[PDB]
Amino acid sequence: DGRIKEVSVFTYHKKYNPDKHYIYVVRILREGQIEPSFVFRTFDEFQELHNKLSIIFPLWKLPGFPNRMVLGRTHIKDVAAKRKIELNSYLQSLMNASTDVAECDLVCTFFHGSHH
């Protein structure tokens, strides 16, 4: 797009600063820079990002977002490991979205500020 040239979920980990949950480490590569940046975002921030996109855009403009209640009974680390994938495909979908999605303020905010 503008600056952002590629994004990906690079890896994640199991934090305890309140109690849980996981953090997803997101690698971003901008046009104006040679080195990636990395930001850290939980499942619920990506959710909160989608929810705010829906306020201002029609859903058919946006990727679908990955949430299953519990598949059936599963499973701490296991869900983290399926989110690495699902969040990453969300991200690829969201940034090859129209320009007004890819480059809109709500999606640049999401991606500024390592922990914020």
mmCIF file with all atom_site columns, C-alpha atoms in Angstrom, residues 32-111:
data_model
loop_
_atom_site.group_PDB
_atom_site.id
_atom_site.type_symbol
_atom_site.label_atom_id
_atom_site.label_alt_id
_atom_site.label_comp_id
_atom_site.label_asym_id
_atom_site.label_entity_id
_atom_site.label_seq_id
_atom_site.pdbx_PDB_ins_code
_atom_site.Cartn_x
_atom_site.Cartn_y
_atom_site.Cartn_z
_atom_site.occupancy
_atom_site.B_iso_or_equiv
_atom_site.pdbx_formal_charge
_atom_site.auth_seq_id
_atom_site.auth_comp_id
_atom_site.auth_asym_id
_atom_site.auth_atom_id
_atom_site.pdbx_PDB_model_num
ATOM 1  C CA . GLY A 1 32  ? 10.231  3.972   4.103  1.00 0.00 ? 32  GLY A CA 1
ATOM 2  C CA . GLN A 1 33  ? 12.350  1.415   6.120  1.00 0.00 ? 33  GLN A CA 1
ATOM 3  C CA . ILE A 1 34  ? 14.765  -1.512  5.600  1.00 0.00 ? 34  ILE A CA 1
ATOM 4  C CA . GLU A 1 35  ? 14.096  -3.297  8.906  1.00 0.00 ? 35  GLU A CA 1
ATOM 5  C CA . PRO A 1 36  ? 10.702  -4.727  9.910  1.00 0.00 ? 36  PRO A CA 1
ATOM 6  C CA . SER A 1 37  ? 8.864   -3.359  12.922 1.00 0.00 ? 37  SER A CA 1
ATOM 7  C CA . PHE A 1 38  ? 7.224   -5.761  15.380 1.00 0.00 ? 38  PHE A CA 1
ATOM 8  C CA . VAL A 1 39  ? 4.059   -4.986  17.449 1.00 0.00 ? 39  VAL A CA 1
ATOM 9  C CA . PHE A 1 40  ? 2.335   -7.097  20.093 1.00 0.00 ? 40  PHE A CA 1
ATOM 10 C CA . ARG A 1 41  ? -1.441  -7.653  20.015 1.00 0.00 ? 41  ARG A CA 1
ATOM 11 C CA . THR A 1 42  ? -3.774  -10.163 21.693 1.00 0.00 ? 42  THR A CA 1
ATOM 12 C CA . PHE A 1 43  ? -6.563  -12.027 20.022 1.00 0.00 ? 43  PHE A CA 1
ATOM 13 C CA . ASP A 1 44  ? -8.997  -9.445  21.568 1.00 0.00 ? 44  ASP A CA 1
ATOM 14 C CA . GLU A 1 45  ? -7.257  -6.518  19.947 1.00 0.00 ? 45  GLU A CA 1
ATOM 15 C CA . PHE A 1 46  ? -7.612  -8.053  16.570 1.00 0.00 ? 46  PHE A CA 1
ATOM 16 C CA . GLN A 1 47  ? -11.293 -8.753  17.410 1.00 0.00 ? 47  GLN A CA 1
ATOM 17 C CA . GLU A 1 48  ? -11.715 -5.177  18.650 1.00 0.00 ? 48  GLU A CA 1
ATOM 18 C CA . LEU A 1 49  ? -10.062 -4.075  15.364 1.00 0.00 ? 49  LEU A CA 1
ATOM 19 C CA . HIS A 1 50  ? -12.591 -6.020  13.353 1.00 0.00 ? 50  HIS A CA 1
ATOM 20 C CA . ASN A 1 51  ? -15.522 -4.837  15.362 1.00 0.00 ? 51  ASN A CA 1
ATOM 21 C CA . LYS A 1 52  ? -14.468 -1.205  14.695 1.00 0.00 ? 52  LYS A CA 1
ATOM 22 C CA . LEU A 1 53  ? -13.973 -1.750  11.070 1.00 0.00 ? 53  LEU A CA 1
ATOM 23 C CA . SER A 1 54  ? -17.568 -3.081  10.858 1.00 0.00 ? 54  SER A CA 1
ATOM 24 C CA . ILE A 1 55  ? -18.880 0.211   12.294 1.00 0.00 ? 55  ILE A CA 1
ATOM 25 C CA . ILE A 1 56  ? -17.728 2.118   9.281  1.00 0.00 ? 56  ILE A CA 1
ATOM 26 C CA . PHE A 1 57  ? -17.561 -0.434  6.497  1.00 0.00 ? 57  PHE A CA 1
ATOM 27 C CA . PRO A 1 58  ? -20.060 -2.937  4.927  1.00 0.00 ? 58  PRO A CA 1
ATOM 28 C CA . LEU A 1 59  ? -18.900 -6.479  5.783  1.00 0.00 ? 59  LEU A CA 1
ATOM 29 C CA . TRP A 1 60  ? -18.461 -7.547  2.269  1.00 0.00 ? 60  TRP A CA 1
ATOM 30 C CA . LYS A 1 61  ? -15.465 -5.045  2.279  1.00 0.00 ? 61  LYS A CA 1
ATOM 31 C CA . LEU A 1 62  ? -13.811 -6.879  5.154  1.00 0.00 ? 62  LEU A CA 1
ATOM 32 C CA . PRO A 1 63  ? -12.330 -10.372 5.692  1.00 0.00 ? 63  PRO A CA 1
ATOM 33 C CA . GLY A 1 64  ? -14.216 -12.702 7.819  1.00 0.00 ? 64  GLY A CA 1
ATOM 34 C CA . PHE A 1 65  ? -12.792 -12.985 11.300 1.00 0.00 ? 65  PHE A CA 1
ATOM 35 C CA . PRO A 1 66  ? -11.917 -16.200 13.077 1.00 0.00 ? 66  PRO A CA 1
ATOM 36 C CA . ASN A 1 67  ? -14.003 -16.994 16.150 1.00 0.00 ? 67  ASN A CA 1
ATOM 37 C CA . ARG A 1 68  ? -15.320 -20.457 17.199 1.00 0.00 ? 68  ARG A CA 1
ATOM 38 C CA . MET A 1 69  ? -16.816 -20.551 20.739 1.00 0.00 ? 69  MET A CA 1
ATOM 39 C CA . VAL A 1 70  ? -14.966 -23.745 21.621 1.00 0.00 ? 70  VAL A CA 1
ATOM 40 C CA . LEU A 1 71  ? -14.549 -26.106 18.592 1.00 0.00 ? 71  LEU A CA 1
ATOM 41 C CA . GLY A 1 72  ? -16.000 -28.699 21.054 1.00 0.00 ? 72  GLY A CA 1
ATOM 42 C CA . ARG A 1 73  ? -13.859 -28.968 24.316 1.00 0.00 ? 73  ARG A CA 1
ATOM 43 C CA . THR A 1 74  ? -10.264 -27.797 23.086 1.00 0.00 ? 74  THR A CA 1
ATOM 44 C CA . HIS A 1 75  ? -7.603  -26.492 24.444 1.00 0.00 ? 75  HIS A CA 1
ATOM 45 C CA . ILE A 1 76  ? -5.002  -23.770 25.679 1.00 0.00 ? 76  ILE A CA 1
ATOM 46 C CA . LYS A 1 77  ? -1.729  -23.885 23.543 1.00 0.00 ? 77  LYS A CA 1
ATOM 47 C CA . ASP A 1 78  ? -3.646  -25.611 20.720 1.00 0.00 ? 78  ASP A CA 1
ATOM 48 C CA . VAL A 1 79  ? -5.935  -22.555 20.117 1.00 0.00 ? 79  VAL A CA 1
ATOM 49 C CA . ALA A 1 80  ? -2.948  -20.176 20.245 1.00 0.00 ? 80  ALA A CA 1
ATOM 50 C CA . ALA A 1 81  ? -1.437  -22.296 17.516 1.00 0.00 ? 81  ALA A CA 1
ATOM 51 C CA . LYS A 1 82  ? -4.553  -22.113 15.265 1.00 0.00 ? 82  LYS A CA 1
ATOM 52 C CA . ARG A 1 83  ? -4.849  -18.373 15.916 1.00 0.00 ? 83  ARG A CA 1
ATOM 53 C CA . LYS A 1 84  ? -1.232  -17.833 14.630 1.00 0.00 ? 84  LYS A CA 1
ATOM 54 C CA . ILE A 1 85  ? -2.628  -19.085 11.344 1.00 0.00 ? 85  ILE A CA 1
ATOM 55 C CA . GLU A 1 86  ? -6.097  -17.536 11.336 1.00 0.00 ? 86  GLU A CA 1
ATOM 56 C CA . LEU A 1 87  ? -4.820  -14.106 12.511 1.00 0.00 ? 87  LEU A CA 1
ATOM 57 C CA . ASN A 1 88  ? -2.177  -14.259 9.860  1.00 0.00 ? 88  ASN A CA 1
ATOM 58 C CA . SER A 1 89  ? -4.698  -14.956 7.075  1.00 0.00 ? 89  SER A CA 1
ATOM 59 C CA . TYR A 1 90  ? -6.930  -12.218 8.491  1.00 0.00 ? 90  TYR A CA 1
ATOM 60 C CA . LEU A 1 91  ? -3.985  -9.858  8.107  1.00 0.00 ? 91  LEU A CA 1
ATOM 61 C CA . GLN A 1 92  ? -3.128  -10.954 4.531  1.00 0.00 ? 92  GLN A CA 1
ATOM 62 C CA . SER A 1 93  ? -6.812  -10.531 3.644  1.00 0.00 ? 93  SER A CA 1
ATOM 63 C CA . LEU A 1 94  ? -7.207  -7.180  5.319  1.00 0.00 ? 94  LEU A CA 1
ATOM 64 C CA . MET A 1 95  ? -4.155  -5.609  3.523  1.00 0.00 ? 95  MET A CA 1
ATOM 65 C CA . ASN A 1 96  ? -4.878  -6.787  0.014  1.00 0.00 ? 96  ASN A CA 1
ATOM 66 C CA . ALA A 1 97  ? -8.454  -5.303  0.824  1.00 0.00 ? 97  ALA A CA 1
ATOM 67 C CA . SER A 1 98  ? -9.539  -2.166  -0.965 1.00 0.00 ? 98  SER A CA 1
ATOM 68 C CA . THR A 1 99  ? -7.277  0.838   -0.326 1.00 0.00 ? 99  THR A CA 1
ATOM 69 C CA . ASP A 1 100 ? -9.809  2.474   1.840  1.00 0.00 ? 100 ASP A CA 1
ATOM 70 C CA . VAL A 1 101 ? -9.626  -0.490  4.201  1.00 0.00 ? 101 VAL A CA 1
ATOM 71 C CA . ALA A 1 102 ? -6.014  -1.370  3.992  1.00 0.00 ? 102 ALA A CA 1
ATOM 72 C CA . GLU A 1 103 ? -4.984  2.223   4.571  1.00 0.00 ? 103 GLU A CA 1
ATOM 73 C CA . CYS A 1 104 ? -7.661  3.586   6.816  1.00 0.00 ? 104 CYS A CA 1
ATOM 74 C CA . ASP A 1 105 ? -6.865  5.087   10.116 1.00 0.00 ? 105 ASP A CA 1
ATOM 75 C CA . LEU A 1 106 ? -8.245  2.247   12.154 1.00 0.00 ? 106 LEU A CA 1
ATOM 76 C CA . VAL A 1 107 ? -5.849  -0.235  10.506 1.00 0.00 ? 107 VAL A CA 1
ATOM 77 C CA . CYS A 1 108 ? -2.733  2.087   10.694 1.00 0.00 ? 108 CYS A CA 1
ATOM 78 C CA . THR A 1 109 ? -3.522  2.696   14.434 1.00 0.00 ? 109 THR A CA 1
ATOM 79 C CA . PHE A 1 110 ? -3.695  -1.080  15.108 1.00 0.00 ? 110 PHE A CA 1
ATOM 80 C CA . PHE A 1 111 ? -0.320  -1.255  13.584 1.00 0.00 ? 111 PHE A CA 1
#
